[PDB]
Amino acid sequence: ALGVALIGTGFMGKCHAMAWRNVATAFGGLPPRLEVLADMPADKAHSLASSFGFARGTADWREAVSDPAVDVVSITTPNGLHREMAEAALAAGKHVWLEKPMALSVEDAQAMEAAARASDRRTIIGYNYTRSPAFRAAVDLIAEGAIGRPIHFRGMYDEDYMADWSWRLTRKDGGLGALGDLGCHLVSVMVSLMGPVARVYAQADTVITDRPHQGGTARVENEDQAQALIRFASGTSGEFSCSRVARGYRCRLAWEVQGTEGTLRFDQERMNELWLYQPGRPEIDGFRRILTGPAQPGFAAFCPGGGHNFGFNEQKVVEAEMLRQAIAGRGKAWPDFTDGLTIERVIHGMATSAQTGQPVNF
Amino acid sequence: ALGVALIGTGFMGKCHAMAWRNVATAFGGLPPRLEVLADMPADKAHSLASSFGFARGTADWREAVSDPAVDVVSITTPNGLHREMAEAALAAGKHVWLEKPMALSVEDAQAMEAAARASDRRTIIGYNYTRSPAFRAAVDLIAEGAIGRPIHFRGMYDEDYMADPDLPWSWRLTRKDGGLGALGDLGCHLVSVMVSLMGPVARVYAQADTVITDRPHQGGTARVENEDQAQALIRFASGTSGEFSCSRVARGYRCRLAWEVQGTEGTLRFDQERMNELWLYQPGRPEIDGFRRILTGPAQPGFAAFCPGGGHNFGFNEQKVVEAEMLRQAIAGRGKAWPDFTDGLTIERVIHGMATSAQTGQPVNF
Amino acid sequence: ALGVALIGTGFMGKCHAMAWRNVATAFGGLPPRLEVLADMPADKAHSLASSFGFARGTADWREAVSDPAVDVVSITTPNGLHREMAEAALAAGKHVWLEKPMALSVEDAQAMEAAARASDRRTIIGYNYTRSPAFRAAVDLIAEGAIGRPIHFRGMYDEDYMADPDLPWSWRLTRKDGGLGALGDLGCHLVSVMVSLMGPVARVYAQADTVITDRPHQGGTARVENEDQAQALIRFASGTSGEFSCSRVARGYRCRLAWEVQGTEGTLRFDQERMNELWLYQPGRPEIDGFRRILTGPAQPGFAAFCPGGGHNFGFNEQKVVEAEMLRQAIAGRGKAWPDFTDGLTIERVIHGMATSAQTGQPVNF
Amino acid sequence: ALGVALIGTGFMGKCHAMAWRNVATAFGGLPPRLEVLADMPADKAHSLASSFGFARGTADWREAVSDPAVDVVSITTPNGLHREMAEAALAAGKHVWLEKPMALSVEDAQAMEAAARASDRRTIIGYNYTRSPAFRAAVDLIAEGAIGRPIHFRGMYDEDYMADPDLPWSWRLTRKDGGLGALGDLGCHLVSVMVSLMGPVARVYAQADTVITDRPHQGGTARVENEDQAQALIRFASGTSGEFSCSRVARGYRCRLAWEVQGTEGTLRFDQERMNELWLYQPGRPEIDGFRRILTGPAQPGFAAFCPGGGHNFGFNEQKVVEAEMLRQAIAGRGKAWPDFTDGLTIERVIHGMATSAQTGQPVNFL
Numbered sequence A: 001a002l003g004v005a006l007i008g009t010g011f012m013g014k015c016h017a018m019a020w021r022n023v024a025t026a027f028g029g030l031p032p033r034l035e036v037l038a039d040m041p042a043d044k045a046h047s048l049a050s051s052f053g054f055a056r057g058t059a060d061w062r063e064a065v066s067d068p069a070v071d072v073v074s075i076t077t078p079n080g081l082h083r084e085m086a087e088a089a090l091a092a093g094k095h096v097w098l099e100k101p102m103a104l105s106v107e108d109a110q111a112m113e114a115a116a117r118a119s120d121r122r123t124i125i126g127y128n129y130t131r132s133p134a135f136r137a138a139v140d141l142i143a144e145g146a147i148g149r150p151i152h153f154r155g156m157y158d159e160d161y162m163a164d165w166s167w168r169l170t171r172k173d174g175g176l177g178a179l180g181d182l183g184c185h186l187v188s189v190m191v192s193l194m195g196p197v198a199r200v201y202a203q204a205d206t207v208i209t210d211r212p213h214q215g216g217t218a219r220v221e222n223e224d225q226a227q228a229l230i231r232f233a234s235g236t237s238g239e240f241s242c243s244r245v246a247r248g249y250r251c252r253l254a255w256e257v258q259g260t261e262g263t264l265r266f267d268q269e270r271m272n273e274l275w276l277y278q279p280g281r282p283e284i285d286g287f288r289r290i291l292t293g294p295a296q297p298g299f300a301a302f303c304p305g306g307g308h309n310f311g312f313n314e315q316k317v318v319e320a321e322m323l324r325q326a327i328a329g330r331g332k333a334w335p336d337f338t339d340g341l342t343i344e345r346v347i348h349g350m351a352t353s354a355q356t357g358q359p360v361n362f
Numbered sequence B, C: 001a002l003g004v005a006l007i008g009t010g011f012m013g014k015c016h017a018m019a020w021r022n023v024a025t026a027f028g029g030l031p032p033r034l035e036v037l038a039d040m041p042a043d044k045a046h047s048l049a050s051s052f053g054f055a056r057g058t059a060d061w062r063e064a065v066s067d068p069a070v071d072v073v074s075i076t077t078p079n080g081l082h083r084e085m086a087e088a089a090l091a092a093g094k095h096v097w098l099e100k101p102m103a104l105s106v107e108d109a110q111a112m113e114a115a116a117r118a119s120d121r122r123t124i125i126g127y128n129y130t131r132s133p134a135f136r137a138a139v140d141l142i143a144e145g146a147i148g149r150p151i152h153f154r155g156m157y158d159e160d161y162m163a164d165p166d167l168p169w170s171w172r173l174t175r176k177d178g179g180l181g182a183l184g185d186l187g188c189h190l191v192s193v194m195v196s197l198m199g200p201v202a203r204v205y206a207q208a209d210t211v212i213t214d215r216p217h218q219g220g221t222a223r224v225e226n227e228d229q230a231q232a233l234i235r236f237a238s239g240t241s242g243e244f245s246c247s248r249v250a251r252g253y254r255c256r257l258a259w260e261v262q263g264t265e266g267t268l269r270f271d272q273e274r275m276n277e278l279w280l281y282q283p284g285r286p287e288i289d290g291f292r293r294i295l296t297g298p299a300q301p302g303f304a305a306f307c308p309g310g311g312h313n314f315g316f317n318e319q320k321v322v323e324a325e326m327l328r329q330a331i332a333g334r335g336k337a338w339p340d341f342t343d344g345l346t347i348e349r350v351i352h353g354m355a356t357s358a359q360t361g362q363p364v365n366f
Numbered sequence D: 001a002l003g004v005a006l007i008g009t010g011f012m013g014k015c016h017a018m019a020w021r022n023v024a025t026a027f028g029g030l031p032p033r034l035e036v037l038a039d040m041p042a043d044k045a046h047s048l049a050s051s052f053g054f055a056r057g058t059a060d061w062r063e064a065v066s067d068p069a070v071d072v073v074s075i076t077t078p079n080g081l082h083r084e085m086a087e088a089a090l091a092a093g094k095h096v097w098l099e100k101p102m103a104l105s106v107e108d109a110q111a112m113e114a115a116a117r118a119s120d121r122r123t124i125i126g127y128n129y130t131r132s133p134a135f136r137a138a139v140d141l142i143a144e145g146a147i148g149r150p151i152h153f154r155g156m157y158d159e160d161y162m163a164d165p166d167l168p169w170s171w172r173l174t175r176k177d178g179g180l181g182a183l184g185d186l187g188c189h190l191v192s193v194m195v196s197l198m199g200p201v202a203r204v205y206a207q208a209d210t211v212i213t214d215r216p217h218q219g220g221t222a223r224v225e226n227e228d229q230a231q232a233l234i235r236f237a238s239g240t241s242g243e244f245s246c247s248r249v250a251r252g253y254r255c256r257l258a259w260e261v262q263g264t265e266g267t268l269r270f271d272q273e274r275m276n277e278l279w280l281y282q283p284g285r286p287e288i289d290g291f292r293r294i295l296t297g298p299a300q301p302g303f304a305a306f307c308p309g310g311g312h313n314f315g316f317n318e319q320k321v322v323e324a325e326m327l328r329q330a331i332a333g334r335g336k337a338w339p340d341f342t343d344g345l346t347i348e349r350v351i352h353g354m355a356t357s358a359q360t361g362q363p364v365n366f367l
């Protein structure tokens, strides 16, 4: 049974807590033991440790990583703390489940990538949109030749949370803006579908410059939206965007792969639907709405009946299981810190391209 | 902490187990203790006890309901076992979380309802489609006057799990040990939603059909005795009209519990295959007039306990976590759970009334 | 060239004018001669005859039907005038394109049906929702065996043009001079579609409601006599089941004629608000299993006459050009026009039987 | 009444013929006189003149354009003939309704633009997707401040009419004789819509591909010389960002001209495959918050001329009736026709500028 440390209890902290709690319920084997939860202040950590089922809560994150009963550390803190916490966890001999993006800079991710190799421990980064049954089904369909050769990718990730204060808005805590917060997710899906990125040309904007209800000066330090044209190492084209100010959208990570023999389209706001076009007889020709069910990777561990909608949080249960199987030497987790470094190079290259008005080659 | 016993480990058993496991994570308080898991054969129970995180497994459900470390019993076994297991649990002084429908007949349900009344323990029935944030938001919107007075309800629940005529016959397709067909599997869920939106059913007029009448049975065929599909017109106690259907042979549908409430000042529409969307129409200025797509997020009941970010789709299994919490709070004396065995008996009467109406070609009043 | 008379210039009158104008553009042959347009008052008739391309306008419908240069008469006037105008046109030896419903009563429709048989002239009724490429494709798909045998129909027709309670009372809301309500305006259309997919209706059980019972009337108010909404359970002659509804007070809906046919081997579903989409489910291998969205294009009946490329949305008004062509062909002695007054009389019996069932609380058998 | 000449009878020729027939039916006034139809061969012209309701057919387009009974000429021929036919019509003193794109090159379009300005006759180009009630309603909503200030545009135009590699070659797929590929066929439409919503384009950075490089040609094989798809990042004169694409090989799409304008106070979204729907988000109370589906009806520009009841779907062909009416009004001096040949030349510059950017790997400024 894997011993678990959890650092942070917010959006992702609670998501990881629920995932670790049910990974064996869904996939079998032994239930992970919830050992230590870290958060500030201490009374909050004690409270959440009690309700989450952790053996203790502490205000000292170092206390979580150094617990001998811990085998794996979930890190769900602001981006500015990822590098320090992940390097400490790896040095401590712990496997690491790190939230995206890796850190603030390419240099940070490079140091982390080197630390991971030196430690001989497993790493996985929290790119949970790669875990839906629909997404995994799409990957397999492409590999099987269902849409022929990919000839164009178009992807977006729109939300509007910033169009209504967060550490996400600072360079010391968040790093990049929309690119770092949402863009990296789109990259994780995009490269899994299309292969590695060879070239980007990008542009960006900040639409809301100051948080109007903060009272004191509250300068937004990073971008609200960005777009890029892509060339993949295959030579194929892509379109790419992200935004945290696109009003009306809440989790609109949407993508499509146009192939020579068909098209696949997906929208995370309806994460249980995968749209597949393949040529057919004229009288019955059109896109198929594939509703998520037990034929798709991972779904049958949660439900034997199709159409009982798989949830956002259940992607994290799948993610936990992939890390669990990697730790046992039964599969390879993706992306590890090496695969993740490439993703960081992409989003940071997009940022560079937007700043300079020049294409960036990889 | 609440001591939990779980009977069965299938579709609903595993769903209940996931719910009990995460209920305090989502909603606070103390994590329930997973004491005893019951299933057959013994090896299976031992294995699933280990992976589900229950202190022990047993092949003897009676031991499970009798354990002094157990306070509440989740009953997820087949319909023909509900009555026996629930009456035993209640007689052992345990609260009960019972899967739908209550049993095979109204008479069984009445008998269980009588047992529950004399028990002074809390009961809840597994009508999980009433727990989605979208459904709960819709109920609140109607109470707040968002659509004015309801003037018509239209609901359906289509699935195709029995559509293939080569699927083998079973005792579940007999009236005796299977009870109702589509009305029992799906109809009861639609009633649970419908009465929550519209109030009590006063009258039904129904029709029903067995579409695939004979199915393969070791070498030859055997007759299917209960209905593949049913439809009904409704009058509510308010006088308001309704349409109602269910089907287990409706090809292409997987979990299409879909409903609509039309009112004097607007319309609400929902489809469970897209459980994170609620469609609301209210009159607006001509230039911007039209239905709104309300995407599930923390403004809707229960959602914020699972995720702070709107549009991160709430799942089918998370409905069961909400249901666990409602029972948990009822056990603590901090709110009534719905539907209890009394509320559930009325639902049983409605579905069996529809079957009676369909057999007679006559309306049935309640 | 066919000589055309047109009576009325409103919603359908202008629709018919546009149809007759482009029917040969789309389908070939000789453009019909637009000879006489009748409307009132006379100034409107003269102005519209000029802009519609008619040789002359008149305020006297009887003059239009008797003109020796006329072969066919479009009748798009209010329901109370249908019987008289159709009988006069037929007596004058003209073919008739009559707007739905046939008349205000079954009695009137029976007289019209006898008159049409007595004349040796073609008749067609304006059930234009049967003319879409999507609908005609659906019929052909079922005729190819695409969904096996139909086992259930579910149809609705929702609109909200009377939902506003301050809309004034009129004689159209009385039984005597208005006939049916929502069943007469909308229900007849749903029946036309329904029987085209499922065959003849054997029995109905219906309910109905006047939701807005009183409306402004010259300073005070007056009572609405006919129904704002109705619903019915259908038993088809084939033995199969159906659900049916209509409403003129269903807020947010504008032309929601929506139907589905569930079959033994698939399902077809359609919504007129998206008239260029037809949803087809057929069983498929599990990896790719699901409904197909069929977007209207040249593979569907009639579409290629208007556009060679798919996805260029076919319009509501182009249904009428198709309807005109079906009549032209029937007059020429090629195709048959459906529904003629005999086919139409049956539709009238069904909708009036629904109204009777709702009033009496009893099923009505055909 | 306006006298009409029609050149060509294909996809657009028949569409124009249907539009001219019903323009007065929808909008009033005098029905145009359908005088001369030109098409080849002569038998076909005579046959279609009859069924389309034109007084006569000819195989000599030059004769049709100089007929003194003709006031306006619809030109629906292939792109390589537009320049010659439009210049001759204008020189004969006729108004012109020209199909898109203008011609093969920017130089051709500059020639046509000069000819129109010299003729003092009205011109309109067939950008019919700017005529839908939904699109026109969207422009009005933006002008009224319904979504605040635009902060982003994302538009696409996907179809699959060339996605099948077995579909035969044509001279359309050469540079010399067909011009641009998807940019010319579809991109121009997307630009017409885009600039109407966002204003003029200041900069493009683009890329393009030929996906099917060869096609069957009467027993042999021939190379496809123009692009099957293209994408571009845009900066508008406003400073606002844009994404743009087109494709003739995007499998499963038939007329997927789809766009959205994201603003400071809301979002508008549209897809031509459901041309009767306009999606509008404006901030609302959290309990009811979300995009509205606005179904096309008489509150939207032009719809009421075709139908008095909402939700009776307006069709593709009816866009062309609206286009005809705009040209009639312009000819009568009671309205502006957009885009005329001057407006059209800007559209040509954008699409050819995208083509240039894709070839050079460098951004192209227009300012």
Ligand SMILES: NC(=O)C1=CN([C@@H]2O[C@H](COP(=O)(O)OP(=O)(O)OC[C@H]3O[C@@H](n4cnc5c(N)ncnc54)[C@H](O)[C@@H]3O)[C@@H](O)[C@H]2O)C=CC1
Binding pocket: A007, A008, A009, A010, A011, A012, A013, A038, A039, A040, A059, A061, A076, A077, A078, A079, A081, A099, A100, A101, A126, A127, A128, A181
């Ligand atoms: N994969 C995905 O879908 C998502 C990923 N994320 C990522 O997860 C991470 C966390 O984001 P949220 O949960 O949204 O942030 P949050 O603000 O909701 O939570 C941050 C947590 O870290 C805790 N914390 C901060 N400093 C700490 C310290 N020194 N020691 C211990 N605990 C500390 C906070 O008290 C809080 O519990 C970020 O890296 C973010 O990019 C966030 C949301 C979704």
Ligand SMILES: NC(=O)C1=CN([C@@H]2O[C@H](COP(=O)(O)OP(=O)(O)OC[C@H]3O[C@@H](n4cnc5c(N)ncnc54)[C@H](O)[C@@H]3O)[C@@H](O)[C@H]2O)C=CC1
Binding pocket: B007, B008, B009, B010, B011, B012, B013, B038, B039, B040, B059, B061, B076, B077, B078, B079, B081, B099, B100, B101, B126, B127, B128, B185
């Ligand atoms: N609320 C919902 O959405 C759903 C509810 N259900 C309900 O779940 C229940 C189970 O459904 P079935 O299809 O019958 O499932 P099933 O045939 O899989 O049986 C359920 C479980 O009961 C166990 N079991 C059977 N006999 C037992 C015994 N004597 N002692 C202990 N365990 C025993 C089985 O091994 C299995 O683990 C039914 O009441 C059904 O209506 C089912 C699916 C969804």
Ligand SMILES: NC(=O)C1=CN([C@@H]2O[C@H](COP(=O)(O)OP(=O)(O)OC[C@H]3O[C@@H](n4cnc5c(N)ncnc54)[C@H](O)[C@@H]3O)[C@@H](O)[C@H]2O)C=CC1
Binding pocket: C007, C008, C009, C010, C011, C012, C013, C038, C039, C040, C041, C059, C061, C076, C077, C078, C079, C081, C099, C100, C101, C126, C127, C128, C185
């Ligand atoms: N098939 C379809 O989709 C539709 C059918 N209809 C049908 O169209 C018909 C007309 O609809 P209403 O609402 O009554 O429209 P309405 O009240 O606009 O009248 C229709 C036309 O008849 C003219 N008219 C009335 N009395 C006349 C007379 N004595 N002589 C000559 N012209 C006369 C009117 O001026 C008007 O142009 C009805 O039968 C109705 O059911 C209406 C809308 C859609």
Ligand SMILES: NC(=O)C1=CN([C@@H]2O[C@H](COP(=O)(O)OP(=O)(O)OC[C@H]3O[C@@H](n4cnc5c(N)ncnc54)[C@H](O)[C@@H]3O)[C@@H](O)[C@H]2O)C=CC1
Binding pocket: D007, D008, D009, D010, D011, D012, D013, D038, D039, D040, D059, D061, D076, D077, D078, D079, D081, D099, D100, D101, D126, D127, D128, D185
């Ligand atoms: N606005 C829009 O949505 C659309 C515009 N178009 C445009 O319409 C134009 C034509 O395309 P289609 O209609 O698809 O082409 P098509 O090839 O279907 O039709 C060409 C027409 O021109 C005729 N023609 C050719 N040479 C001629 C000559 N020398 N004299 C007289 N007639 C001649 C042909 O016989 C045929 O009638 C192109 O410019 C194209 O870009 C095409 C489709 C849609």
Ligand SMILES: O=C1O[C@@H](CO)[C@H](O)[C@@H](O)[C@@H]1O
Binding pocket: A305, B159, B161, B185, B186, B189, B254, B255
């Ligand atoms: O209660 C249920 O019964 C199953 C049929 O046994 C259906 O598949 C479920 O979707 C439904 O919730």
Ligand SMILES: O=C1O[C@@H](CO)[C@H](O)[C@@H](O)[C@@H]1O
Binding pocket: C159, C161, C185, C186, C189, C254, C255, D309
């Ligand atoms: O026949 C009809 O009647 C009108 C109501 O009078 C509706 O608005 C139309 O949609 C319908 O086709």
Ligand SMILES: O=C1O[C@@H](CO)[C@H](O)[C@@H](O)[C@@H]1O
Binding pocket: C309, D159, D161, D185, D186, D189, D254, D255
């Ligand atoms: O201008 C157009 O070109 C055609 C291709 O030539 C497309 O099929 C049409 O949808 C488009 O409007």
